[PDB]
Amino acid sequence: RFLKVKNWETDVVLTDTLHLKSTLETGCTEHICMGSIMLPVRTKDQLFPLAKEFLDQYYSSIKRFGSKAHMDRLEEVNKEIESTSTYQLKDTELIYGAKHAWRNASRCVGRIQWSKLQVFDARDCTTAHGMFNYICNHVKYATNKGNLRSAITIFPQRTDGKHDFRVWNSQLIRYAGYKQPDGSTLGDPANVQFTEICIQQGWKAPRGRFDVLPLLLQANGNDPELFQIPPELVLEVPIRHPKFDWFKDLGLKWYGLPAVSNMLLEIGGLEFSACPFSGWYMGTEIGVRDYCDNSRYNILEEVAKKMDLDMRKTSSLWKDQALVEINIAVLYSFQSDKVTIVDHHSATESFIKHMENEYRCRGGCPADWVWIVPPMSGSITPVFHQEMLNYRLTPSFEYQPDPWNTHVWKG
Amino acid sequence: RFLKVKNWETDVVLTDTLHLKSTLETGCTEHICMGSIMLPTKDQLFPLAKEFLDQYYSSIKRFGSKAHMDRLEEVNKEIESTSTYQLKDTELIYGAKHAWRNASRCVGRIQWSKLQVFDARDCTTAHGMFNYICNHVKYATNKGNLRSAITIFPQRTDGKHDFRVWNSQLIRYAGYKQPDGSTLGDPANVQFTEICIQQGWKAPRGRFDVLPLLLQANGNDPELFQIPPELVLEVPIRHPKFDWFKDLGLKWYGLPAVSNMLLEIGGLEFSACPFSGWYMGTEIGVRDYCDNSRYNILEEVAKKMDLDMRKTSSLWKDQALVEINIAVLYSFQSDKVTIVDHHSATESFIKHMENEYRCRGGCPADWVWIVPPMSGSITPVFHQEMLNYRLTPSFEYQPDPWNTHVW
Ligand code: HEM
Ligand code: HEM
Ligand SMILES: Cc1cc(N)nc(C[C@@H]2CNC[C@@H]2OCCCCCc2cc(F)cc(Cl)c2)c1
Ligand SMILES: Cc1cc(N)nc(C[C@@H]2CNC[C@@H]2OCCCCCc2cc(F)cc(Cl)c2)c1
Ligand SMILES: C[C@H](O)[C@H](O)[C@H]1CNc2nc(N)[nH]c(=O)c2N1
Ligand SMILES: C[C@H](O)[C@H](O)[C@H]1CNc2nc(N)[nH]c(=O)c2N1
Ligand SMILES: [Zn+2]
C-alpha cells in the first residue's frame, strides 16, 4: 500500500511505504484518534522473532542480507536464546540499534543528526559507582566545553526485570524544586517529587533556585545511590538580553546539556532500561517550556512588568511579546558563550530536509506533528504546514514508569 | 472503552464516554496515526434518520414518548414513499446547532447554542440565494457587534440538483497572477478569481478586491452577484505604537463566513449552508498576514521595525509576527468589531470542554487545529489532552464545485 503526505505551503507530495514495516500499536483506531494523548521480563517464545527481525534489518543495512555471516549470526542467536533465555548484541549491532532508535523517534525534530551519535557501551557495568563514572565521562565527552556532541551510554539490558539498571533522574542535569509551606515553589516545579526523594535518601540540599540535582543510580536491581556530578563538569549559561540590560538581574541561568535518562531503549527484543542520551538544545525548550510554562519557572509576568507592557488585558499580547524576548535572550546567551544551540526556525527547516531525504532513501519518516511543531510561532515554521504520518518502528525509545513506583526496596 | 484525558498543566483528569456514540471513521488505525492529515439510498437513510430523531427526542426529555414514536413512523413512511424526508423546523435548528457542537476543529464552540438559524429551504434560484445571503451578512454583522448565524439552503435530492455557494467564504479578497511572476492580493483565491473573471466579473485588480458571490441553485450553472459594499464591514489595520504600520495599506473584513462545507443532519445533506461567527485574531494576523502562501508580509514589517534580518536566531520573524497580531486586535477593537484573542478563546474552550465532559460525557477535539498558530504552549489548550472522533450532525469538507459540476 502507498500513503501520501502533502505540504500545504509548497504542494510537495510524498509517498510513504515504510509504515508497512510498523508493528507496534499507535493507540488510535478507525473510531478514535489519540494523537494528542501523551501516553496512549519477556518469554523465550516471542524473543527470537524480534531478534530475527532486528538482525535481518541490520544485515540488509550493511548489504549482507542472506550472507553466510547473516545466517550464522541468526543461528548463533537462536542457540543462545534457547540455552540462556536471552542474547547479547555485538558492538556493531548495538551501535546500529541505538542510531536507529533515534532515527525512528517520531517526536524528535533533531533527527537530521541521527547518524552522528557517539555510542558508549557500558554493558560491563555492575554497580552504581560504576554507573556514576560512566555518566561523568558521558557528560564531559558530550559537553566538550560547549561544542556539544551527541552521545548515548548503554548499561546492561533487562534480565528478569528484578535486576534492572535505572537512572532515577529524568535528565542527567536538572534543578531541584522545593515546595514551600506557603504553597509556593522554590526552583523548578517539575522536579519537586524527585527532589523530595533525593532529600529523603540523604542529599543535603542548598535550597536555592538553580541547585543541580544529584544522580540517583540503581545498578542490578539494587536500591539507588546518590552521587553529586562534579560541578566543573556541569556547563551552565547565565541568561542575558542583547538590548535589555535589566534582563541579567532576573538571575536566570540554564545548563547547556539536555540529557534524557528515563527512557527505555528496545533493540531486537532486548530492553535497555538505562540508556541516558544527550544532544543539544533547541532554544524554545528552555525559553518557552522551562521558563514560561505556568507549571515551570513561570517568568512571563516578571519579564512583562520590566518591559512595561500593558498587562491589563490579554489582548495587548503582552505574554506573546515577553515570550519572544526571553527566547531571544536564551539564544543570545548560548551563542555569546559558544555553547551549541539551535533556533526553532533553523531546526524545523533542517527537519523538513531530513524528512524529505528519508522519504526518498528510506520510504518514510514517522513524525508526530503534535511534538514536532515548536511551542511558539508554530505556523511561521515550515513543519506546521507539513502533513506527517505517525507510526512506531523498532529499534525504539519508549517511556517507562518512574522507578520509585515499581522498585522493590531492599534497605 | 471508557477513556481519560489529562491536562498536564492542571492534572485535571476527565473521562470520555461520548466517543462510543461515534459513528464515522477517523483515518487512523492501530498501526498509523493520521492526526495531521488535512483530509484523512433508501437503505442507508432510515438508520441515519432514526439515530438523529432518537437523539433529538432524548434532548427534549421525550425519548420513547407518543410524540417520539409518532415522528419515527412519519419519517419512515416518508422515506418508504418519497426516498427522502423533511426536517421539522425544530429538528433543523437543533441539527445545525449540534453540527457546530460536534465540530472537533472549532475552538469557539462555547458559543454553540447561541446560533441563529435561517431556514432557506424554500429557496429556488441564485437570485433568491443572493437575497438570503445578503440578509445573513447584514444580520450577522450587526454593525460590528457580530452574531453567529447559518443559512440553510435546500437539501440534496438525487445529487444533480445541488445548491452550492462556489465561494470558500462569503467575503474573501481576490488573487491575481501578474506578468511579474508574483501574486497580487490573496494567493489562496487565484483559482476562484480566474473562474469569476472567466464567468464575467470586472476585476479592479487591486490588493483587496472583495470577490463576487458565485451562486448555484438546483444544480444549475452558477451566477455572479456583488455583495452591497455597505454590507461588507472592513477594518483598516493600524498599530497602537507604530505610526508607520497604517502605511502598509493593510485591511481585513470583519465577518468570517465559511460557505463551502456540507451540513449532514439525520442522513440528509445540505450542500449550501454558509455559517459565520467572529474572528480569533491569529486567524488574520498569523495565517492571513504571515503564511508564506498568504499575504506573506513579515519581511516588510520586520524591515520597518529595522530588526536584524541577517540570522533566523534574532527571532525577527517572531517579533514581527507578534506586532502584526497586536495591530489586528487593536484595530478591530478600536472600530468596535467583535474579535477574540487566542488567550481568551482557548481559555473559553477549556471551560467549554469541562462543561461538555460534565454535561455530555465528552467533547471531540482536534488538538492540531485547536492549538493557535502562535504561542501554542502559553495557551491552556496546549497542555490539554483531547480525543478526536466524528459525531453526527456534522460539517464536512466537500470537493470544490468546479471540479464536480456538470457545466
Ligand atoms: C542533537 C540535537 C537534538 C535536538 C535539537 C533534539 C530536539 C528534540 C526536541 C525539541 C524534542 C521534544 C522535546 C520536548 O519539547 O519535550 C525531542 C524529543 C526527543 N528526542 Fe531529540 N533532539 C536531539 C537529539 C536527540 C538524541 C541524541 C536522541 C537519542 C539518541 C533524541 C531522541 C529523542 C526522543 C526519544 C524524544 C521524545 C522524548 C519523549 O518522548 O519524552 N534526540 N528532540
Ligand atoms: C463564534 C466565534 C467562532 C470562533 C472564534 C471560531 C473559531 C474557529 C477557528 C479559529 C477555527 C480554525 C480556523 C482555521 O484555522 O482555519 C474554526 C474552525 C471551524 N469552526 Fe469555528 N468559530 C466560531 C464560530 C463558528 C460557527 C458559528 C460555526 C458553525 C455553525 C463554526 C464551525 C467551525 C467548523 C466546521 C470549523 C472547521 C472548518 C474546517 O474544517 O475547515 N465555528 N473555528
Ligand atoms: C508523560 C511523558 C511521556 C513522554 N514520552 N515524555 C515525557 C517528557 C516530557 C515532555 N516535555 C517535557 C518532558 O520532556 C523532557 C524530556 C525530552 C527532551 C528531549 C530533548 C533532547 C535533546 F537532546 C534536545 C532537546 Cl531540545 C530535547 C513525558
Ligand atoms: C482542504 C481544507 C479542508 C478543511 N477542512 N478546511 C480547509 C480550510 C482552510 C484551512 N486553513 C485555512 C482555511 O480555513 C479557513 C476557513 C475556516 C475559518 C473558520 C472560522 C470560522 C469562524 F467563524 C471564526 C474563525 Cl477565526 C474561523 C481546507
Ligand atoms: C496534551 C499534549 O499532547 C501535550 O501537552 C504535548 C503537546 N506537544 C508537546 N510537544 C513537545 N515537543 N513536548 C511536549 O511536552 C508536548 N506536550
Ligand atoms: C499539516 C497540518 O495538518 C495543517 O497545516 C494544519 C495544522 N493546523 C491547522 N490549524 C488550523 N486551525 N488551521 C489550519 O489550517 C491548520 N492547518
Ligand atoms: Zn490518530
For every residue of A319-373, DSSP letters joined together read HHHHHHHHHHHHHHHHHHTT--EE-HHHHHHHHHHHHHHHHHHHS-----HHHHS
**CB within 8 Å: B315 and A327:** yes
Q: Which of B299, B185, B304 is nearest to B241 (CA)?
A: B304
What contacts 24+ positions apart, CB below 8 Å, involve A75-81?
A77/A48, A77/A51, A77/A52, A78/A48, A81/A44, A81/A47, A81/A48, A81/A51
Q: Using CA atoms, how far apart are residues A381 and B374, in angstroms rounded to an integer?
A: 10
Q: Which residue of B has its CA nearest to A5?
A: B37
Q: Kindly give the distance from the C-alpha atom of residue A370 to the centroid of ligand 5, in angstroms, as a whole number.
A: 6
At B68, which helix (H) or strand (E)? helix B66-82
Ramachandran region, residue A377 (left: φ > 0; alpha: ψ -120 to 50; beta: rest): left
- In three-state secondary structure terms, A107 is coil
- Considering only CA atoms, which residue is closest to atom 14 of ligand 2? B283
Of residues A9, A22, A34, nearest to B32 (C-beta): A22
Q: Which residues line ligand 6 (CB under 6 A)?
A: A 8, 384-387; B 36, 38, 368-369
Q: Which amino acids of A are annotated catalytic?
A: 108, 111, 280, 285
Grid coordinates standing for A346?
533553523
Ligand 3 atom 13: the closest Cα is on which residue? A170
Nearest-Cα residue of chain B relative to residue A393 = B31
Do the Cβ atoms of A328 and B314 come within 8 Å?
yes
Q: Which residues pair with B165 in a beta bridge?
A: B215
Give the DSSP letter of residue B3. Answer: E
In 3-state terms, what secondary structure has residue A198? helix
Decide: A322 and A303 in contact? Cβ < 8 Å. yes
Enclosing H/E stretch for A13:
strand A13-16
Task: Identify residue A109 by its one-letter amino acid code.
Answer: V
* CB-based contacts of B194, cutoff 8 Å, min separation 6: none
**Lookup: cell for B112:** 454553540
Q: How far is CA A154 from CA A137, A267, A277, B65, in A?
A: 13, 11, 9, 68
Q: Do A155 and A113 have their domain in common? A: yes
Give whole-number Cα distances, A263 to A259, A273, A277, in Å. 11, 7, 9
Distance CA B193, CA B187 (A): 10
Q: Are A112 and A351 in contact (CB under 8 A)?
A: yes
Query: Cβ of A36 and B368 within 8 Å?
Result: yes
Determine the length of chain A: 411
Residues of B in contact with A28 (CB under 8 A): 26, 28-30, 32-35
* Contact assessment for residue B161 and residue B154, using Cβ atoms and an 8 Å cutoff: no
Whole-angstrom distance, CA of residue B382 vs CA of residue B346: 9
CB of B139 within 8 A of CB of B149? yes
Taking the C-alpha atoms of residue B343 and residue B329, their distance in angstroms, rounded to an integer, is 12
For the Cβ of B173 lying below 6 angstroms from any atom of ligand 4, the answer is no
CA of B256 to the centre of ligand 2 (A): 9
Residue B252 lies in a domain: yes
CA of A371 to the centre of ligand 5 (A): 6
Give dist(CA A269, CA A81) in Å, integer: 11
A138 neighbors A107 (Cβ within 8 angstroms): no
Angle at A57 between CA A56 and CA A62, to 5 degrees: 100
CA B172, distance to chain mean position in Å, is 13
Please state the three-class secondary structure of B262-294 as a single string: EEEECCEEECCCCEECCEEHHHHHHHHHHCCCC
List C-alpha distances in Å: A28 to A32, B25, B337, B366. Answer: 6, 11, 41, 13
Q: Which ranges of B142-189 would DSSP assign to H, the alpha helix?
A: none
Residue A301: strand, helix, or coil: helix
Distance CA A33, CA B366 (A): 9
A27 and A81: one domain?
A: yes
Contact criterion met (CB below 8 Å) for B227 and B134: yes
Left, alpha or beta for B239 (phi > 0: left; psi -120 to 50: alpha)?
beta
Does A330 reside within a domain?
yes
Q: Which three cell numbers stand for residue B348?
A: 473559553
The rounded radius of gyration (Å) of the Cα atoms in chain A is 23
Q: Indicate the DSSP class of residue A223.
A: P
Please tell me the distance from the alpha carbon of residue A101 to that of residue A116, in angstroms, as a whole number: 13
Q: What span, in angstroms and rounded, lies between the C-alpha atoms of B148 and B112?
A: 9
How far apart CA A359 and CA B35 sit, in angstroms, is: 19
Taking alpha carbons only, the member of A160, A153, A24 closest to residue A86 is A160
Any atom of ligand 1 within 6 Å of the Cβ of A190:
no
Strands A277-278 and A259-260: antiparallel
Q: Which residues contact A82 (CB under 8 A, 6 or more apart)?
A: A44
Resolution (A): 2.0
| Residue to mutate, A99, A107, A344, ligand 1, most ligand atoms under 8 Å from C-beta | A107
Q: Kindly list the residues from chain A whose CB atom is less than 8 angstroms away from the CB atom of residue B312.
A: 343, 345-346
Q: Which atom of ligand 3 is nearest to the CA of A284?
A: 26
Q: How far apart (Å, rounded) are the C-alpha atoms in residues A323 and A377?
A: 10
A108 and A63 both lie in a single domain: yes
A353-390 as b/e: b if 16+ CB within 10 A:
ebbeebbeeebbbbbbbbbbbbbbbbbbbbbbbbbbbb
The CATH number of whichever domain residue A185 belongs to comes to: 3.90.440.10
CB pair distance less than 8 Å for A324 and B322: yes
Inter-chain CB proximity B35 and A35 less than 8 Å:
yes
CA distance B371 to B256: 19
CA distance A98 to A101: 5
How far apart CA A312 and CA A69 sit, in angstroms, is 71
The enclosing domain of B20 has a CATH number of 3.90.340.10
For chain B, percent helix, then strand, then coil, each to nearest 5?
A: 40, 15, 45
* Residues from chain B contacting residue A314 (CB–CB below 8 Å): 341, 343-344
How many A/B residue pairs have CB atoms within 8 Å? 206
Distance CA A381, CA B321 (A): 12
Q: Is B393 in the pocket of ligand 2 (CB under 6 A)?
A: no
Do the chains contact at A26 and B29, CB–CB below 8 Å?
yes
Whether residue A387 lies inside any domain: the answer is: no
Question: Would you say the C-alpha torsion B279, B284, B288, B291 has a positive or negative sign?
Answer: negative
- Read off the C-alpha cell for A256: 547547556
Give the C-alpha separation, B219 to B295, whole Å: 34
A78 with A180, same domain: the answer is no
Pairwise CA distance, residues A309 & A317, whole Å? 9
* Nine-digit cell string for A224: 539507588
| Nearest chain A residue to B333, by CA | A315
d(CA B12, CA B357): 12
Reduced to 3 states (helix: H, G, I; strand: E, B; else coil), residue A49 is helix
Question: Residue A270 is part of which domain span?
Answer: 16-123+150-160+264-278+348-372
Q: Please tell me the distance between residue B397's alpha carbon and the centre of ligand 4 in angstroms.
A: 10
Cell match 544522580: residue? A215
What is the distance between the terminal CA atoms of chain B, rounded to a whole angstrom? 48
Q: Is the CB of B375 under 6 A from ligand 4?
A: no
Q: What is the largest CA-CA distance in chain B?
A: 74
Quote the distance between the C-alpha of residue A278 and its chain's center: 7
Let me know if B122 is exposed, middle or buried by CB neighbors in 10 A (0-12, 13-18, 19+): exposed
Q: Give the distance from CA B89 to its chain's centroid.
A: 23
Q: How far is the CA of A278 from the centre of ligand 1 (A)?
A: 8
Determine which one of B112, B166, B278, B367 is catalytic. B278
Do A275 and A155 touch, CB atoms closer than 8 A? yes
How many angstroms separate the CA atoms of B387 and B367, rounded? 8
- Kindly write down the DSSP assignment for every residue of A124-139, as one continuous string: T--SHHHHHHHHHHHH
Is there a contact between B253 and B211 (Cβ–Cβ < 8 Å)? no
Contact assessment for residue B16 and residue B3, using Cβ atoms and an 8 Å cutoff: yes
Q: What angle do CA A130, A132, A134 make, to 5 degrees?
A: 70
Residues B131 and B212 in one domain: yes
d(CA A372, CA A387): 11
Which residue is catalytic, options B71, B91, B101, B109? Answer: B109
CATH value at residue B311:
3.90.1230.10
Burial of B93 (0-12, 13-18, 19+ CB in 10 A): middle
- Determine the Cα–Cα distance for residues A108 and A102; give it in Å rounded to an integer: 8
d(CA A229, CA A231) in angstroms, rounded, equals 6
CB contact under 8 A, B34 and A32: no
**Helices B42-59 and B89-101, interaxial angle, to 10°?**
90
Q: Which residues of B325-358 are buried (b: 16+ CB within 10 A; e: fewer)?
A: bbbbbbbbbeeebbbbbbbbbbbbbbebbeebbe
Selection from A142, A137, A369 nearest residue A257 by Cα: A142
How far apart are alpha carbons B388 and B381 in whole angstroms? 14
Residues near ligand 5 (Cβ within 6 A):
A 36, 38, 370-371; B 8, 382-385
Length of chain B: 407
Residues A43, A156 share a domain: yes
* Ligand 7 center–CA B5 separation, angstroms: 15
Residue B57, domain member (yes or no)? yes
- Comparing CB atoms, the residue among B22, B25, B30 nearest residue A25 is B30
CB contact under 8 A, A292 and B377: yes
Residue B249 and residue B200 share a domain: no
Strand-pairing partners, residue A212, are: A175
Report CA A59 to chain centroid distance, whole Å.
27
d(CA B353, CA A120): 47
Residue ranges of A for the binding site? 36, 108, 171, 280-281, 285, 370-371, 384, 399
Clarify whether residues A213 and A137 are in a common domain: yes
Q: Are A292 and A229 in a shared domain?
A: no
C-beta of residue B185 within 8 angstroms of C-beta of residue B173: yes
User: Cα separations (Å) of A245 from A250, A288, A290, A298, B315?
Assistant: 10, 21, 22, 20, 18
The contacts found for A76-81 with CB under 8 angstroms, 24 or more apart, are A77/A48, A77/A51, A77/A52, A78/A48, A81/A44, A81/A47, A81/A48, A81/A51
- β-strand A270-272 against B13-16: which pairing, if any? unpaired
B280 CB near ligand 4 (under 6 Å): yes
Looking at residue B173, the DSSP 8-state letter turns out to be: B
What is d(CA B72, CA A168) in angstroms, rounded to the nearest whole number?
A: 62
Q: Is B51 labeled as catalytic in the residue annotation? A: no
Tell me which ligand sits closest to the C-alpha of residue A31.
7
Q: Which of B283, B290, B323, B356 is catalytic?
A: B283
Return the amino acid letter for A146.
G
Residue A383 lies in a domain: no
| Contact between A285 and A372 (Cβ < 8 Å) | no
The Å distance, Cα A293 to ligand 7 centre, comes to 26
Half-sphere exposure in the Cβ direction for A260 (13 Å, CA): 15
How many distinct structural domains can be found in chain A? 3
Answer whether residue B138 is part of any domain. Answer: yes
CA B77/CA B72 separation, integer angstroms? 9
Q: Residue B228 is which amino acid?
A: P
Name the 3-class secondary structure at A186.
strand
Q: Which residues of B touch A295 (CB under 8 A)?
A: 8-9, 383
Distance CA(B233)–CA(B137), nearest Å, equals 9
- Cβ distance of B9 and A389 shorter than 8 Å: no
Q: Is the peptide bond before B393 cis (omega within 30 degrees of 0)?
A: yes
**% helix, strand, coil for chain A, step of 5:** 40, 15, 45
Within a domain: residue A107? yes
**Angle between helix A68-84 and A44-61 (nearest 10):** 160
Q: Assess whether B113 and B142 both reside in one domain.
A: no
Nearest to A296 by CA among B368, B8, B5: B8
Residues 6 or more apart in contact with residue A245 via CB below 8 angstroms: none
Report chain A residues whose CB lies below 8 A from the CB of B305: none
**Residue B190 three-state SS:** helix
Q: Which three cell numbers stand for residue A397?
A: 525509545
- CA nearest to A166, candidates A233, A222, A118: A222
Query: How far is it, in rounded angstroms, from Cα B217 to Cα B132?
Result: 13
Task: Give the minimum alpha-carbon distance from B274 to chain A in angstroms, rounded to a whole number.
Answer: 24
Distance (Å, rounded) from C-alpha B66 to C-alpha B63? 9
Rounded Cα distance between A65 and A59, Å, is: 5
Exposed/middle/buried for residue B73 (C-beta within 10 Å: 0-12, 13-18, 19+): exposed
Phi and psi for A235 in degrees, rounded to 5? -80, 130
E-strand ranges in A176-258 read 177-179, 185-187, 215-218, 225-227, 236-238, 253-255
Do residues B238 and B336 both lie within one domain? yes
Q: Mutate which of B7, B22, B378, B390 to test chain A, going by most A C-beta atoms within 10 A?
A: B378
Residue A275: CB atoms within 10 A of its CB come to 26
The C-alpha atoms of residue A41 and residue A64 are separated, in whole angstroms, by 32
DSSP tag of A268? T
**Position of cell 507578534?**
B322
Contact B28 A25 (CB under 8 A): no
Query: Which of A260, A342, A370 for mutating ligand 5's site (highest number of atoms within 8 Å of CB)?
Result: A370
CB B19 within 8 A of CB B389: yes
Query: What single-letter DSSP state applies at residue A158?
Result: P
Residue A355 lies in a domain: yes
Q: Which residues of A are annotated as a binding site for L-arginine?
A: 171, 280-281, 285
Q: Which residue's alpha carbon is nearest to atom 11 within ligand 4?
A: B287
| Bridge partners (DSSP) listed for residue A260 | A171, A277
The CA distance from B401 to the nearest CA of chain A, in Å, is: 20
Closest CA to A283 of A342, A353, A329: A342
From first CA to last CA, the distance across chain A in angstroms is 55
Q: Tell me which residue has its CA closest to atom 4 in ligand 2.
A: B108
In terms of domains, do A329 and A246 share one? yes
Residues near B87 by beta carbon (within 8 Å), at least 6 away in sequence: B95, B265, B266, B268
Query: Torsions phi, psi of A132, nearest 5?
Result: -45, -45
